[PDB]
Paper text:
Bacterial hybrid malic enzymes (MaeB grouping, multidomain) catalyse the transformation of malate to pyruvate, and are a major contributor to cellular reducing power and carbon flux. Distinct from other malic enzyme subtypes, the hybrid enzymes are regulated by acetyl-CoA, a molecular indicator of the metabolic state of the cell. The larger ME isoforms (hybrid enzymes) are predicted to be a fusion of two unrelated enzymes; a catalytic N-terminal ME subunit and a C-terminal phosphotransacetylase (PTA) domain. The PTA domain is homologous to PTA enzymes (that interconvert acetyl-CoA and phosphate to CoA and acetyl phosphate), yet they appear to lack critical catalytic residues and thus acts as a sensor instead.
We were successful in obtaining the acetyl-CoA bound inhibited state (MaeBbound), diffracting to 2.72 Å resolution. Full-length MaeBbound retains the architectures observed for the isolated structures, placing the ME dimer twofold axis immediately below that of the PTA d2:d2 dimer axis. The folds are in excellent agreement with those observed in isolation (0.6 Å rmsd between ME domain structures, 1.2 Å between PTA domain structures). The resultant hexamer forms a disc measuring ~100 × 175 × 195 Å, with the ME domains twisted with respect to the triangular PTA edge. The individual ME and PTA domains are linked by two α-helices, the first, referred to here as L1, composed of a region unique to hybrid MEs (residues 422–437), and the second, L2, formed from the first α-helix of the PTA fold (residues 438–457). The relative orientation of the ME and PTA domains results in very few contacts between the two—L1 packs against the ME core via several conserved hydrophobic residues and L2 is ampipathic, with a hydrophobic N-terminus interacting with the PTA d1:d2 interface, and a polar C-terminus partly solvent-exposed. A key structural feature of the inhibited conformation of MaeB is the presence of a clash between the L2 helix and the ME domain surface, which results in the disordering of the ME hook subdomain. Disorder of the hook is apparent in all six chains of the hexamer, with small differences (chains A–D disordered from residues 371–383, residues 370–379 in chains E and F). Interestingly, residue F386 at the base of the hook is an equivalent position to human ME residue L507, which has been shown to be involved in the conversion to the closed catalytically active state. It is likely that our inhibited MaeBbound structure represents an inactive state by both disordering the local hook structure and limiting the dynamics of d1.
Numbering used by the authors:
A (entry chain F): 15 to 369, 380 to 777
B (entry chain E): 16 to 369, 380 to 776
C-alpha cells in the first residue's frame, strides 16, 4: 500500500521483531551475579515477602510494573480485530508509559470476549502487577469489565479509552470557561458519540460542577432522550436527557460546549451559527475532526477549539493523563485510581496551562499543556499522589515532595526528552512570533534523504523549506518518491532567481581581493551551495542545511566564504550525545584539523555558551592521551587551552590536559586527580585534533546505544549547518529541528538590533 | 545471613526488582512515536488481522515466554504464595534471557484451583510464543500441564517436571555407554515422588529402558501395583509389579539410583549391594543423598551426579529449557512434544562426548557444564529439527548455518567472550598437567591489584608473584582482609637468587644504550625492570603492571628489556564487546603518530589476534575522510591499507574511511560500494594516539559495552600495562587475557 505504512511495517519487523525487550536491571554476567539473582540467593527476598507481603514492592518490579491488557475488540479506529492483531498497539502503549513516566509495562492480549471469562482470567493476575491499564475493549463490555475489576482487584484498574479524553478535555473546558467568564453550573453541553469516552466525559464534567440536565447525549440515532427504546442499553441511560430536542442540530441550539466523539464533517456551519456566544468546540474524532479550527473560526470568530490533532492548537492527547496518573498511583503503592485522583490530574493539567527564552501564552489557543511538555509529570504525578493518600487509598506516604520531583526528573533524562523539548521550543518560538516558521534553504533539492526528512518536517511545523534546483526535476523526484506533503514548497533555480545578480554583486564585493571577480562571482552564485549561503547572509532565508550528498569541506566552504565567522569566533563542528543522566557536547568534530591552544579555547567557549542555552552548567575538559602531564605536544596544547579558556571565562569549570574517562567520570577524577578543578564530570569535551573528534563521535553514534545529533556548525554569523553525508533521514530530521532553533535565535537577535 | 543480606540489597538497590521493559527500536522523537503507536502501528495490526500468523513478524511474540507460577512449590521453600514467588520468577526470566536470549514476562497467579488457573492461563495465548510453568506443587501441576498442553496451541512446559529428567537422561545415556550397558537391561529405582519423578521414568523408557525394570519409591516405600496407602492417578503411572517393598530391597542388584529425595537416604548397605559400576544420581537439594567422595568410599566403581556445582556431573535445569524453548520458538511450534525433549537429551549427551580444546569424557564428565557456551548452538537446532520432523513446527528452518549464525548472534561476545576466555585458560592449564601461569605483579602493594587477585587466585586463573618489601605487602594484604593471598609468593628484587644474573643480562642488552653495570644493578632493583627481566628469562610466564603508575613509565622498562619481535611494533589493543560482534581498537597506547607502514603492521597484529578467536578479521584504516586520499592522514591511511593488503592479500583491508563508514555495512554499500570491505569492519586502526586513546576510553565510559584492554602487542614475551584508571574488575579481565597470552607463548616456545 502507501509509503508511511510500509515504513511502519519495516519499523516493526526489522532487527528484533516487535517493539519491546525485557532486560536485567542488575548485573548478571558472572556466575556469582546469578547466584544472587537466582538460587540460592533469590530465596532471601522470597522468604521476606512471605513473612511481610507488602515487601513484594521492595524486592520486585511491581512498584513500577503496569499491565496493558486488551482483547482487541476496539483497537484504535480499526474496531474489533482480535487480541493478537491488537498486540502491536499494546506494545506501543507500553512504550508511551516508559517514555512519559518511565513505567515498565507488560502487554497482555487475552483471547476472551466473554466478560465473565475475561474478568476471571485477569483478576487473578494481581500479584504480578502494580496497576492495570485496560485498553481497547469495546462498549458496552468495557463498562462492565472496568466496574467489576475496579473493586474485585486490590491494585488500580483504569481503562484509558474511557477516561483519558474526559480528564484532558475536562482541564481544557475548565480553562475555556475561565476565559469566557462562564461558570459551569450554567454551562450547556452536548456530547456527540456514545463510545467508551462519552459517559466518562459527562461524569467528569459533572464532578467539575456542570449539571446533568444541562447535558445532552447523542449517538447514531440522534439525541439520547429519556424513554427511548431504539438502540439503548443500561449505560446509555446513565445520562439520557429529558430534553425536547431530538436531532443533533436541535440539541446544539443556543449551546455552549460541543464535545465531538464521532465522525468528520458531522458539525455543520448551520449548527455553529446557533451556539451561544464564545462557543467551545471539542472536535475529537479520528482521523479527521468534526470541523477544522479554520472552518470553525471562519463560521464564528469567537470560537474556542480543541482537536485530537497535533496539527492544531489545544490538542487533547491521552498521553497527558495516564502516565502521570499511574506514576502517582504506583509511587504511593495505591489500591485504586479513584475519582479524587482523576480530578486531581484534571486540575493539575488545567493549572499548568494557566501559568530560558519564550513560553506558551495562556489563552484561547492554549488551554492545556502540550504533550511534549516535560513539566506535566512534575506537576500532575504529585497531585495524583496527594489525592491517593488524602483518599486513603495510598499505602505508602510521600513526605519530601522536592525529593519526589527529583525522583520524577530522573525518569525524564535527555535520552528520552531532549529532542522532544527542542521541538517544543521551536513551537514556542514560532507561536510567540505570530506563528511564522523559520525559512530554511536546502541547496540539495533532489536529495532523497532530504525530501523524505522534509515530509516529516513540514508536517510538524518545524520550518518552511525552500529547495534549490531545477523545478521540473525536483517536482519529478518528489512525485517519484510519492511525497505529496511537498507540493506547496518553494523551489528556486539560482540563476533565474530575481535577486541573483544583487547576490553576485555582494559576493564580488566580499571576495574581489580573494580571487573572485564578477565573472567568477556569477559562476559561483549559480551553485546552490553558494546561492543558499547568500540567501541566508542577505536575509532571504533564516537558515540553511547542506551536505547530505557531498563531502563536508565542499559543502561547508561556501558557508565560510559567504557568511563568515563572527568576531573572534571559530568555525567548529559540535555534536550532542544524549545519555540518560546527562548529555555530552563534543567539539570540534568537523572543521579544524589541528587547532591551536587558542583555537581549542575558543571552541570550548562556543560549546559552553550553547550548553548554557539549554540551562546546563557547562563543565569543560580539554581531552588528551595524557593526565595532567603538560608534556611537549598534545598535552601542553590542551593544558594551555584550559588555562586560556579559564582566563576568558573564569566562572566555568574548565580543565585539561586529561584522558577521556578521567574527564567524564567524576570518581576517577576524585580518586586520581583531586587537585583538578573539574568536579562532577565534564559535559563538554573538546578534542586536540580532527581525527579524535570525528572518529569518536561517529563510533559512539554507531556502536554506543545513545542518540547523537549533529554536527552543528558553530562560530559563524548566520544560521547554517552541514550534515554528515552518512546521515540517515531521521538524522536529518533531528538536525533540522536544531537548525530551526539556531535560525529562530539569530533572527530574534537581528530583530533586536 | 550475610549471603542473605547481600542478596536482599541486590534486589533492593537502584531500581526495585531485577527486570525492566525497554524498547528495542527508537521511540523518543515525534516520528518514532508516530511509528510505534498511532497512526503507523495500524499497519502491522491491519496485517495481522488479515493473517494471524504475522503476529510473529511484527511483535515480540516469537521471543516472548511467560514464566507462570502460583508459588505453591517455590524452589525449596514450598507453598509460599504468588507475590512471594515473584523474585524467583523474575530470576527464571533472567536465566532465559542469558542462556537463550529469550524475553520473559514473569506471571505470578493467585489461583490454587486447577480449573480457574487453567482458565486464566489458556486465554493469555495470543500474548506469548510459549508458556513455561514453574514451581507449582504436585499433583496439581500434572493436571495443569496435561490440560494446558491440550488446550493451548503454543508450547506448554513445566520445567520442574521435565528438567532433571532430560539432563539426568543425557547423563544416564553416557554413563551406560562408559559401562557397556544397554538401556533394555538397566535396572533403575527412583526415590521420591515429587514433580520430577514421573518424567524421569518416562524419558528413561523413551531412551530404551523397560517399564518392568523401573521401580518408583516415595516416603512410605515402593510404589507397587495394588498399593492403596497415599496413592493417586499419577503415582500409578509407573507402579511396579515388583515383590520388593522397601527401598533397600529395590536397590539390591540395581544399576541406577535416581534420588529425588532427602539427604542421607542412600546408605552404605543398599549401596554395597547395587550392581557393578553403580550409577548414582543424588539430586536432593540442599544436600545430596550422598556426597561423591563417600559414595566412592563405599563403592570405588561408582559414577555420581549431584544437583550441586561443587561436584562433577552437575544436573541443572539450565541445560534444558533455554535451548528447548529456543528451538521451539524459532520453528514457531505449537508444542514441545516428547520427540523434542529427546532431541535435547541426545544432543546434550553427544556434546559431552566430543574455546580451543575441551574436557575429557569419562565418569567425571557425563554431561556439559551448565555454563558451557556451546550448549545453545548444539541443542537448539536438534530441538528445532525434531519439531519440524514431528510436525509441530509451523516455520521450517532451511539454512542450518544461517540458524547457527543467528544463535551466535544471540550468544554474542557481550555475554560470552570473557566466559570463553576463562574456560580457555582453564583448559590450557588442564591440558598441560595443571600448571597455572606465573604472572608477576610488580605493584605488590597496590590495593586494586590485590583485590583483583582475590578473584584471580580463587578462580584458578594464575600463580601470582607480588613484588615489594615482603613486610609491607603482607601488611597491606592483612589490612584489606584478603585471606586468599597468604600463600602468594612475594619477591624483593635485590633479595632474589637470580637477581645478579638478571642485572648482567640487562647490562649486556643496554651497555651501549646508556647503562653500565652500576646503573644496571640500580635499575634491576626497580620492580618494573625486575618483573620485565623475570618474564624475559622465563622465571615468570607474564606480567601485568600500571595500576599505580602512568603508562609510559610502566611500559618503558618492558620495551627496553623484553622488546619487540621481528618486524613487530609495540601497540596497545582493545576489545569492545558488543552483542553481535567484538571490535578491535589499535594502537591505543604507545605510538603518538604511527606512519603508514606502522599502521599496516599494527593492523596485521590485530588481525592475528582476531584470528586466534576464530573470527575473520576485517580491517579499516580510520580517518576523518572517506576515500579522499588528500595530503595528511587521509593519504596515510589509504597507503596503510595498501601496504597491509600487500602483506596479507587474503584479507579485507580498506581505507581511508570514516568510523561510521567502517563499522556500518549499509553506509558502505550505500556510498562506497567500490570498496573491498564488506559486512562491516571488526578491526579499527587509528591514525594517531589521541584518536585511539580517547575513542576506547569514551566508548568504555558512556557506551554500554564492556571494553577490555589495552593489551600490549608486538612484544616477544607476555606483558601488559593497565590503564591507571582501571577498576578492579578491569584488572581481573586484563589478567585473564594476560594468562592466555602467557600460555600461548609458552606453548609456541617449546617448539
Ligand atoms: C560530518 C563529517 O563527517 S566532517 C568530515 C571531516 N572534516 C572535513 O572533511 C573538513 C576538514 N577541514 C577542511 O577541509 C578545511 O579546514 C576547510 C574546508 C574547513 C577550510 O577550507 P580551505 O579550503 O582550507 O580554505 P577556504 O578559503 O575554503 O576557508 C573558508 C573561509 O572560511 C575561513 N576559515 C576557514 N577555516 C577557518 C578556521 N579554522 N578559522 C577561521 N577561519 C576559517 C577562511 O579564512 C575562509 O574565508 P576567507 O578566505 O575569505 O578568509
Ligand atoms: C592506557 C593509557 O592510558 S596510555 C596513555 C597514552 N600513551 C602514553 O602516554 C605513552 C606515550 N608514548 C610514549 O611515551 C613513548 O612512545 C613510549 C613510552 C612508548 C616509549 O618512549 P621512549 O621514552 O622513547 O622509550 P625509550 O627511549 O626508553 O625506548 C623504548 C624501547 O622500546 C623501542 N621502542 C619504543 N617505541 C617503539 C616503537 N613504536 N616501535 C619499535 N620500537 C619501539 C625502542 O627501540 C627502545 O628500545 P632501545 O633502547 O633498544 O632503542
Amino acid at each position: 500500500t502507501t509509503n508511511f505504512d510500509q515504513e511502519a511495517l519495516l519499523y516493526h519487523q526489522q532487527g528484533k521483531p516487535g517493539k519491546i525487550e525485557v532486560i536485567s536491571s542488575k548485573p548478571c554476567a558472572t556466575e556469582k551475579d546469578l547466584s544472587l539473582a537466582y538460587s540460592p540467593g533469590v530465596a532471601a527476598p522470597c522468604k521476606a515477602i512471605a513473612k511481610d507481603p507488602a515487601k513484594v514492592y521492595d524486592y520486585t518490579a511491581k512498584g513500577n510494573l503496569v499491565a496493558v491488557i486488551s482483547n482487541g475488540t476496539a483497537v484504535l479506529g480499526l474496531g474489533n480485530i482480535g487480541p493478537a492483531a491488537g498486540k502491536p498497539v499494546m506494545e506501543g502503549k507500553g512504550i508511551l508509559f516508559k517514555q512519559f513516566a518511565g513505567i515498565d509495562v507488560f502487554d497482555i492480549e487475552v483471547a476472551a470476549t466473554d466478560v465473565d471469562v475475561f474478568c476471571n482470567a485477569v483478576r487473578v493476575l494481581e500479584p504480578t502487577f502494580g496497576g492495570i491499564n485496560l485498553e481497547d475493549i469495546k462498549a458496552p463490555e468495557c463498562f462492565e469489565i472496568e466496574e467489576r475489576l475496579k473493586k474485585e482487584m486490590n491494585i488500580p484498574v483504569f481503562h484509558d479509552d474511557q477516561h483519558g479524553t474526559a480528564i484532558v478535555s475536562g482541564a481544557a473546558l475548565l480553562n475555556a470557561c475561565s476565559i469566557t467568564n462562564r461558570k459551569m453550573e450554567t454551562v450547556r453541553i452536548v456530547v456527540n458519540g456514545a463510545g467508551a469516552s462519552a459517559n466518562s466525559c459527562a461524569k467528569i464534567f459533572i464532578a467539575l460542577g456542570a449539571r446533568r440536565e444541562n447535558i445532552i447525549m447523542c449517538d447514531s440515532q440522534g439525541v439520547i432522550y429519556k424513554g427511548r427504546t431504539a438502540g439503548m442499553n443500561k449505560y446509555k441511560e446513565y445520562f439520557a436527557s429529558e430534553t425536547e430536542a431530538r436531532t443533533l442540530t436541535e440539541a446544539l441550539r443556543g449551546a455552549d460546549v460541543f464535545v465531538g466523539l464521532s465522525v468528520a464533517g458531522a458539525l455543520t456551519p448551520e449548527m455553529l451559527k446557533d451556539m451561544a456566544k464564545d462557543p467551545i468546540i471539542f472536535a475529537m474524532a479520528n482521523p479527521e475532526p468534526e470541523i477544522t479550527p479554520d472552518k470553525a473560526r471562519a463560521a464564528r470568530p469567537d470560537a474556542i477549539i480543541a482537536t485530537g490533532r497535533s496539527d492544531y492548537p489545544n490538542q487533547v492527547n491521552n498521553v497527558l493523563g495516564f502516565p502521570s496518573i499511574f506514576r502517582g498511583a504506583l509511587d504511593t503503592r495505591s489500591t485504586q485510581i479513584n475519582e479524587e485522583m482523576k480530578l486531581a490530574a484534571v486540575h493539575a493539567l488545567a493549572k499548568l496551562a494557566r501559568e530560558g527564552g519564550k513560553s506558551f501564552k495562556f489563552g484561547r489557543d492554549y488551554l492545556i499543556p502540550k504533550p511534549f511538555d516535560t513539566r506535566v509529570l512534575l506537576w500532575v504525578a504529585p497531585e495524583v499522589a496527594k489525592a491517593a493518600m488524602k483518599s486513603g487509598v495510598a499505602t505508602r506516604a510521600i513526605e519530601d515532595w522536592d525529593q519526589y520531583r527529583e525522583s520524577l526528573e530522573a525518569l525524564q533524562g535527555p535520552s528520552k526528552v531532549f529532542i522532544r523539548s527542542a521541538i517544543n521550543r521551536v513551537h514556542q518560538n514560532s507561536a510567540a512570533n505570530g506563528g511564522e516558521l523559520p525559512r530554511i534553504v536546502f541547496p540539495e533539492g533532489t536529495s532523497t534523504k532530504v525530501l523524505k526528512a522534509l515530509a516529516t518536517l513540514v508536517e510538524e511545523k518545524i520550518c518552511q523549506p525552500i529547495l534549490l534546483g531545477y523545478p521540473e526535476r525536483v517536482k519529478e523526484k518528489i512525485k517519484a518518491l510519492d511525497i505529496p506533503l511537498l507540493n506547496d514548497v518553494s523551489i528556486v533555480h539560482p540563476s533565474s532567481h530575481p535577486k541573483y545578480f544583487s547576490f553576485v554583486e555582494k559576493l564580488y564585493s566580499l571576495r574581489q581581493r580573494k580571487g573572485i571577480n564578477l565573472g567568477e562571482a556569477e559562476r559561483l552564485m549559480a551553485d546552490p551551495n553558494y546561492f543558499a549561503a547568500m540567501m541566508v547572509n542577505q536575509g532571504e532565508a533564516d537558515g540553511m542545511v547542506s551536505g547530505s550528498s557531498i563531502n563536508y569541506a565542499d559543502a561547508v566552504r561556501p558557508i565560510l566564504q559567504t557568511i563568515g565567522v563572527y568576531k573572534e569566533g571559530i568555525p567548529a563542528g559540535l555534536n550532542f550525545v544524549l545519555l540518560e543522566d546527562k548529555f555530552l557536547v563534543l567539539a570540534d568534530t568537523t572543521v579544524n584539523l589541528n587547532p591551536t591552544a587558542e583555537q581549542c579555547a575558543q571552541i570550548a567557549l562556543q560549546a559552553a555558551k550553547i550548553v548554557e542555552y539549554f540551562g546546563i552548567e557547562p563543565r569543560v575538559a580539554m581531552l588528551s592521551y595524557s593526565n595532567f602531564s603538560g608534556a611537549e605536544g598534545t598535552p601542553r596544547k590542551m593544558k594551555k587551552a584550559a588555562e586560556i579558556a579559564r582566563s576568558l571565562r573564569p566562572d566555568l569549570m574548565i580543565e585539561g590536559d586529561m584522558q577521556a574517562d578521567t574527564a567524564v567520570n567524576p570518581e576517577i577524577m576524585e580518586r586520581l586527580f583531586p587537585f583538578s578543578g573539574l568536579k562532577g564530570g565534564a559535559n563538554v569535551l573538546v578534542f586536540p585534533n580532527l581525527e579524535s573528534s570525528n572518529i569518536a563521535y561517529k563510533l559512539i553514534q554507531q556502536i554506543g546505544k545513545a542518540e547523537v545529533i549533529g554536527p552543528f556548525l558553530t562560530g559563524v554569523r548566520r544560521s547554517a549547518n552541514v550534515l554528515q553525508r552518512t546521515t540517515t533521514v531521521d538524522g536529518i530530521v533531528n538536525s533540522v529541528v536544531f537548525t530551526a532553533l539556531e535560525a529562530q535565535y539569530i533572527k530574534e537577535v537581528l530583530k533586536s538590533r
